Design a protein around this ligand. Sequence first.
Ligand SMILES: Nc1ncnc2c1ncn2[C@@H]1O[C@H](COP(=O)(O)OP(=O)(O)OP(O)(O)=S)[C@@H](O)[C@H]1O
Ligand SMILES: Nc1ncnc2c1ncn2[C@@H]1O[C@H](COP(=O)(O)OP(=O)(O)OP(O)(O)=S)[C@@H](O)[C@H]1O
Ligand SMILES: Nc1ncnc2c1ncn2[C@@H]1O[C@H](COP(=O)(O)OP(=O)(O)OP(O)(O)=S)[C@@H](O)[C@H]1O
Ligand SMILES: [Mg+2]
Ligand SMILES: [Mg+2]
Ligand SMILES: [Mg+2]
Lengths: 147, 164, 261, 261, 261, 49, 339, 50, 319, 39
Amino acid sequence: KPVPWVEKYRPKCVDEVAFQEEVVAVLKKSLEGADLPNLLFYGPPGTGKTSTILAAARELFGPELFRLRVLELNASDERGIQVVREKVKNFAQLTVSGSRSDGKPCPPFKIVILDEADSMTSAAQAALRRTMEKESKTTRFCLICNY
Amino acid sequence: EEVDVIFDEDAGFLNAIKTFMATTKRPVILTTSDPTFSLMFDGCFEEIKFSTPSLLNVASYLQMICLTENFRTDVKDFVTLLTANTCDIRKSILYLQFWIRSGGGVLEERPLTLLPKCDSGCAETLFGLKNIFSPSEDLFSFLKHKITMKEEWHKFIQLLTEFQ
Amino acid sequence: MFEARLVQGSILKKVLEALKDLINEACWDISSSGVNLQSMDSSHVSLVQLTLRSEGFDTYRCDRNLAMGVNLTSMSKILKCAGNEDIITLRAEDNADTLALVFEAPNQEKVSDYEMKLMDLDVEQLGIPEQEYSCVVKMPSGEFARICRDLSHIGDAVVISCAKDGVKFSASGELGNGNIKLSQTSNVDKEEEAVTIEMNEPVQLTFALRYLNFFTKATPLSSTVTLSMSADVPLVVEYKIADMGHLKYYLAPKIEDEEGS
Amino acid sequence: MFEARLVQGSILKKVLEALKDLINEACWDISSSGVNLQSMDSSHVSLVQLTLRSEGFDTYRCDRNLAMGVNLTSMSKILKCAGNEDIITLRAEDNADTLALVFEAPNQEKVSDYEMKLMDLDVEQLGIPEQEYSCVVKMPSGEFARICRDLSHIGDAVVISCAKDGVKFSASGELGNGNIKLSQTSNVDKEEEAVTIEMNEPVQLTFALRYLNFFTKATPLSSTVTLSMSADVPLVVEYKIADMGHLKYYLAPKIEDEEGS
Amino acid sequence: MFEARLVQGSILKKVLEALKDLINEACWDISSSGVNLQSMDSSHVSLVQLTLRSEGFDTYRCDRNLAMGVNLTSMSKILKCAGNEDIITLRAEDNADTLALVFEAPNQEKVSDYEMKLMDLDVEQLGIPEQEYSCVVKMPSGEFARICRDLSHIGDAVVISCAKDGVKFSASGELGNGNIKLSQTSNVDKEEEAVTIEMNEPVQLTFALRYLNFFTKATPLSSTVTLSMSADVPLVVEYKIADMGHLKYYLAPKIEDEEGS
Amino acid sequence: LSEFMDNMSFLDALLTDVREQNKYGRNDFSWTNGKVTSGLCDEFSLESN
Amino acid sequence: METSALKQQEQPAATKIRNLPWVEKYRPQTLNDLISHQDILSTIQKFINEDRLPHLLLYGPPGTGKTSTILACAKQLYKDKEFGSMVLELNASDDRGIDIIRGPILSFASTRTIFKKGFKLVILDEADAMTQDAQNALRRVIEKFTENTRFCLICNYLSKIIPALQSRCTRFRFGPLTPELMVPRLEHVVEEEKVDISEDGMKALVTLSSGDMRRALNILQSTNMAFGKVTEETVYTCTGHPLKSDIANILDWMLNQDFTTAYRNITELKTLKGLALHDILTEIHLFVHRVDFPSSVRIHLLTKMADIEYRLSVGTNEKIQLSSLIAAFQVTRDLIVAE
Amino acid sequence: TEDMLWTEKYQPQTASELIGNELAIKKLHSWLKDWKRRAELEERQNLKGK
Amino acid sequence: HYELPWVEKYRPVKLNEIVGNEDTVSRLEVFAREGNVPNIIIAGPPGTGKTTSILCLARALLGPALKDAMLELNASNDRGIDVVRNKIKMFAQQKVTLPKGRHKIIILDEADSMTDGAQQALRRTMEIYSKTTRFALACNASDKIIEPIQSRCAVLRYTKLTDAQILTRLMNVIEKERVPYTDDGLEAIIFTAQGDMRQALNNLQSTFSGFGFINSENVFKVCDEPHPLLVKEMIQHCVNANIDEAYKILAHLWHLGYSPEDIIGNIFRVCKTFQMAEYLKLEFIKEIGYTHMKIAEGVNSLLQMAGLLARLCQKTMAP
Amino acid sequence: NASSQRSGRQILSQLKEATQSHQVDKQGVNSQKPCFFNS
Ligand SMILES: Nc1ncnc2c1ncn2[C@@H]1O[C@H](COP(=O)(O)OP(=O)(O)OP(O)(O)=S)[C@@H](O)[C@H]1O
Ligand SMILES: Nc1ncnc2c1ncn2[C@@H]1O[C@H](COP(=O)(O)OP(=O)(O)OP(O)(O)=S)[C@@H](O)[C@H]1O
Ligand SMILES: Nc1ncnc2c1ncn2[C@@H]1O[C@H](COP(=O)(O)OP(=O)(O)OP(O)(O)=S)[C@@H](O)[C@H]1O
Ligand SMILES: [Mg+2]
Ligand SMILES: [Mg+2]
Ligand SMILES: [Mg+2]
């Protein structure tokens, strides 16, 4: 029933993450246009990259459509990138209609938050590049790394 | 034969032979090489285990099959032949048939009392070492002496590769 | 001392293949009147009601009200050993812990007695409002079965809109919307056959497809089925077994949302 | 060159339909006397000995007494294509790897030449020695068919008992017995229906029922069937196809685990 | 902005079960002359050409040329629930990505609106001119169906040779080669159709079993079919529909090599 | 002898072997398992070795 | 299944009013329009024109122009009215196992053409991703139907193709573009697109691309639209590559100061720039052969950095490996400096 | 002029002709001899009954 | 009118034209001459002539009945579980009349691609039906064959062809095809085909069709390997412990687009036949193998290559 | 054998009466080995 502490007190929306000034500003500018580009966050762990991207996903979408329109994936899968590419293809192929009662309709693009993107070989990186180019205007990619 | 081999086409084979277990009036025999099938199968059955046979007895029997085809030989070569095949009688008999019916490998006489010429050199052709070396060359003779020429080096590398 | 005798062995097989997946634990409630099933789906979205009266049974006996719970996979294997023409006795005791299914021999081969367990987790008391519906319709069973199998390949949700013209089963999905309408009577080989409607006002509701897929398996229950559908109360797809009794399956609609602006 | 001409192809179709799931493969031994098909079954409990003499064929020529073996799955899949009113040609060489069935269809010119390959059967010819049977029964084949059906519902094993008034086909069951008594109906209009018993002494033996059903499935081949039965010999079910030949079924009795006193 | 009315759904359901797994995606091109289908197999060994006139429709009207494509799995799956005698309507816009199959009532009770999503795939007109053929024969649908079933049932390569005497359908397989000979003088009695020949030079070709089997799924479209085969031009299986249109089936023969000396 | 056996240890440790050792069981002389029966399904391996 | 329609109209899909796809702007059309690998293209055209076209194996790094080259060969060899009846193209996107070889490939290679007589062509993009058994079937399909049809296999890694499949074909490597003949393409596109760029921008563009035009144009348009100017600093900022001044300062700290101050400065700059140890090792390795060191110093440094780049792959603590990288220089060259 | 593999050319007709695994083959031979004795006893009982 | 490839134009038609593996080919010759062939499994590297050997043996055994008494199943056929259950067993049970000592032959090429279920089924149908049918299988890696078939067969071993044999048959093809050549082209072709007759014939046909003359420059223009003289100069500089020139040449090789894998492969192939001392050759081979496993495991950059260069240089300057 | 199709219904309906009943041929050719199979 209860949730762990790390996912409980993370900021609900943008501008609530302290110590960052321009990153949240550019994120708010992108959210006001209702169009998030392909995003790359790099920094040491326990800094707030995951919190910032999850807050942006919660801000742009609705909370009832927050989980349905984002997909969290890790790049350290043991079966190569074939399983990762097939999961991304399945997520991008499936489309879920959404409606927000707050007054702003949901943007059409889906969000794939990919963690540990710096543990990726060059062949797999080129495969991910061609996968992102295949879904350029339908799915905006998020890459999380330290380096 | 080979009860442990179950495919997806063999749907419900184990339940069928369990019904055969229950409602038989005639002997039923199961043969399998999988040691784990003695544990997985649920039923009442008398267990018989075939151990690996003694090397010298099977070697004498293979020498014997060689004799009844009118060739003489030594015990040690079939000993190492059995060792290479892990005392498999089927593999040894089939390779022995292929080897005897090809006319023999090396004609060397060995006068032993304990007469025609011996036919030693079965395990060398078994591993394909005769395709690498000249028929005058011996394996341990090649290995003991000093390797200097390029072709001897290539023979050494091909021998070690075939064993690697 | 509970002994119920069924006139045909196909009745349990045809009511229970529907109950293969929707219910995890089936709890028979026995009393003087007959046999009741109050099945409570593990997703907390569907209900199953069965009333089987005593006069349909060839013989039926009861001394006290009892509740016997049987696990879903535990009787499905034991029912397939009974033929449709076999004549079946269900026997339970007051204080013992075994349920006996005594089938008559398949064409007088050999008497097959099967034993199982009757421990229920709880009686699972549930109330039925006996409500009044704004739409009640008599429509064939096979038509609903082929509607479900046709819309099943599209998606996972189906929207129904009952109007005075007729019903309109619609299923929007990944490939394309499928729409089947039923109005007035119908022309078949039989002289009389109709999707007949008695109704007050047109209502529409959206439901999960897979739940109607498990109620589809109750197709040989009757030639026709009854549809009760209204604004708020859950949809009834009611099967009559003639003199046996009745069956009513409830499923909760999936609520829709309208855009504020 | 072996050349055989079936005047009517329906008889061969019917005998394969009588033995389609019974025997794995059909072995033919052919001489100047005619075609013989003495096929074992895979469990080796029943043997079919069908003999077609040379004079029953339109044309016939054998230059060397020969034996072939063809899988009857292939021989079953070929003969679906033929009509019921035509002729069949079976052609083979003295040493050939195939045999040809030629069907001239009832059209003016439609020739079907199916050249079927011969399997290298290792099993030699199997047949029981000739012996007098104490019990000889001349009896209608279709009435055997309905007895076999009734006992087939009732049971799977028949304790058949021959008595002076006829043969009684008694089932075995936990509660259901298919005891059907046959009396003398010789004084009847048609000699096929008339039952004559030439039994020397009564003898009791047990038989399975699936093989009896398979044997009696050949009822339209012959008007009446002879039953040859004696002590410790297989039961013979003989049909006489009038002017084409005679077929026999040898069915072994079930073994009995007799208990010591 | 295209609309179309069709007298019966039987013609469409038959022409769609003809091409279930033969064709991956079905792309019809539209014109004032009529409706056309230039499609080619995903393995690129066989081609289908369906040309239907405007006058064979109930009412035909167009505004501009357009070739639209649909996934044949979805186009098949929507049809299984169809009335064979039903009037149907096909409708599209000038630049919409959806094609609607407006379904009328098979039971005089329903109006249905199905939409299918187009896909954006390249299509090139395979511009084959009508060249002369060395052997043009006629052959019934039922007989050709049975003979293709039988030949692909035995062997894996249907070797068809057209000569002056008739059409020889051979199949050299692992089980045993089956050869079939038709003739000019032969006419069947099932549908009273005569095999007539327009032979010019003898031609022998070999084709795959399955693809001819899929071609041979199209029996109820026409009473008879036309086999057109030349020494270099591939096999033509042509069904002429009564007043509706024409269908054409191209299959390229297999590789056969000269036997070494 | 020590030099040769040092190179032999080098060959086993820091050189690739042809067949991947301890693929289905662990290394030799262990009582966990080792009764690895061969495959029993007609589906292909589809491996990326 | 399918998957070709999306690409097929993905290539002619643009806003055409705001988007600027400079990679897709300049594309070759024919063999005379690919101004690179003139020997390979002339050899292939000579093979086509003599009707002596053998099984081709086009291999090399991606983006060098293999697929467009063989598409030009297919369009020139067969006209548009018989392209679909004579050319069979497959990729690794339609991977269902090894049945792709026994499916379309075996059926298509075992029949004649339909309409116009001639030899057919099979193009297999990304053939190294094919499994070993599927390739072991493809070699037999190649062997028994070589006369009727020819096979052109496009792959990226030559080592993942079996020796038999290589030995049934002739191999053509699309090597990287020498920077010289690459630079005229860059000056043509900047002169067309009105971009401010210095010669350091050209050096960075020909360095990061390492002989390709696609990623080169990608880097060029990205840096141009992000900054408005293209220089060494702006390119290595937009790409996020190790800046040359930063690697120079890293080498200065490892070559002048003591252990602890160098360690603190390097760690501070690493967390300031997000710069890993693998890229530091690569750029320092490029730097070592340019800075005049003795032979023994160069050997020792190269051995130690090779060891550290091996240790970083198995996943140890990068902090300890960074301090050992500092130690590798403190052992030899700071001792020589103190000497 | 031989058409046999040596596995079947030198096939052991008797279990005593086998080599090795002596306890196993004597166990199997005793089991099958007991089954033969049971079958012969069943035939004797059938002959006594009729 | 069609240009038959020289692989298929000059395939041997008798077992006495096979070069390489003299003992096994002589035994195949005597078994084709006399008869009663056992179930054989021929294993070796690709290109050594296994399919050609079994085809010639089947032809010499059967003769005119080769179309009827031989069934061939390659990797491009189905060879599934049901195929082994029906088609192979039906061919084994088929009756074919053959002379004494001749049996039907079911060739199963590339038994590596035979799935383990098919092998498990094929055991008994290989075992019992040996009176009329015989099995001739061929593979590369015999470990992929399950142990019951190897028990049920005779395992014949094929080795890599010695360079003299590939030279002799290359000269036979050249003298039958009037190929203009020099000895440098002969050495280049033998280098580009490491004991692989198929690769040598294909490369020779490719350079003769491409440039028309057989010398080293044309062969390495068609085969497009890293040039063995450049790699020999690498190894020669590293013998002298000149890291600057060796890394100069390796940077040249790297900027030409050669991958790490074939670079270290060519370094090993040149270093195997290089003229230096035995101990230095051993240490060079050990370090080359260590670096090659590093390339195999996934780390493959210029830094690893130059590191191997530094280690090879330092093995000379350190006792 | 494993070379044959041996599914449950096939093996019981083809080989149960091999155990439950006698052999019709008991003298003569009996040292022969029917390998059970169904096509
Ligand atoms: N500046 C910040 N403002 C608000 N919350 C913060 C801040 N920095 C860290 N946190 C919280 O610290 C927790 C961990 O941060 P996360 O964003 O989940 O992970 P991270 O910082 O991306 O590091 P990773 O995911 O291991 S690379 C979350 O609960 C954040 O809300
Ligand atoms: N030599 C070249 N000169 C200029 N542009 C080129 C060249 N080669 C490729 N391109 C560009 O790359 C595009 C397509 O090249 P590709 O054929 O995809 O490259 P590739 O060698 O096949 O590697 P892939 O496709 O990424 S595996 C062309 O449309 C050009 O924009
Ligand atoms: N020993 C040889 N003597 C002569 N020609 C040979 C020899 N080995 C190979 N060849 C030639 O190479 C061609 C191909 O040889 P194959 O036998 O197909 O190779 P392989 O032994 O089957 O190995 P695979 O097929 O790649 S697993 C033959 O047609 C010959 O032209
Ligand atoms: Mg995170
Ligand atoms: Mg490409
Ligand atoms: Mg081969």
